[PDB]
Amino acid sequence: MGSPIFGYSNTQQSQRVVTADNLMYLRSGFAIDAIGTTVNNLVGGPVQGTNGGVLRAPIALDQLQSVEVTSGLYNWGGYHIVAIKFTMKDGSSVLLGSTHYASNKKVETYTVPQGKRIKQINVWTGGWLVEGFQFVY
Ligand SMILES: CC(=O)N[C@H]1[C@H](O[C@H]2[C@@H](O)[C@H](O)[C@@H](CO)O[C@@H]2O)O[C@H](CO)[C@@H](O)[C@@H]1O
C-beta atoms surrounding 123 within 10 Å: 26
Ligand 1: which of 30, 32, 42 to mutate, judged by most atoms within 8 Å of the beta carbon? 30
Strands of the chain, DSSP E: 6-7, 12-17, 23-28, 32-36, 43-44, 54-55, 59-60, 64-74, 79-88, 93-97, 102-111, 120-125, 130-136
Ligand 1-lining residues (CB < 6 angstroms): 28-31, 33, 50-54
Resolution (A): 1.8
Dist CA 118 CA 115 (whole Å): 10
Beta pairing partners, 69 = 84, 108
3-state secondary structure (DSSP) of residue 35: strand
Q: How was this structure determined?
A: X-ray
What single-letter amino acid sits at 10?
N
Burial call 37-64: b when 16+ CB within 10 Å, e when fewer: beeeebbbbeeeeeebbebeebbebeeb
Please give the span between the terminal C-alpha atoms of the chain, in angstroms, as a whole number: 5
| Measured CA distances, 62 to 91, 112, 115, 118 (Å) | 14, 10, 9, 8
Query: Is the separation of the CB atoms in 106 and 71 below 8 Å?
Result: yes
Q: Rounding to the nearest 10 degrees, give the CA dihedral for residues 109, 114, 115, 117.
A: 0
Ligand 1: which of 33, 47, 48, 54 to mutate, judged by most atoms within 8 Å of the beta carbon? 54
Q: What domain range is 114 assigned to?
A: 1-137
Task: Report the CATH number at residue 121.
Answer: 2.100.10.30
Domain count, the chain: 1
Between the CA of 98 and the centroid of ligand 1 the distance, in Å, is 11
Q: Can you say how many angstroms the Cα of residue 127 is from the centroid of all Cα atoms in its chain?
A: 15
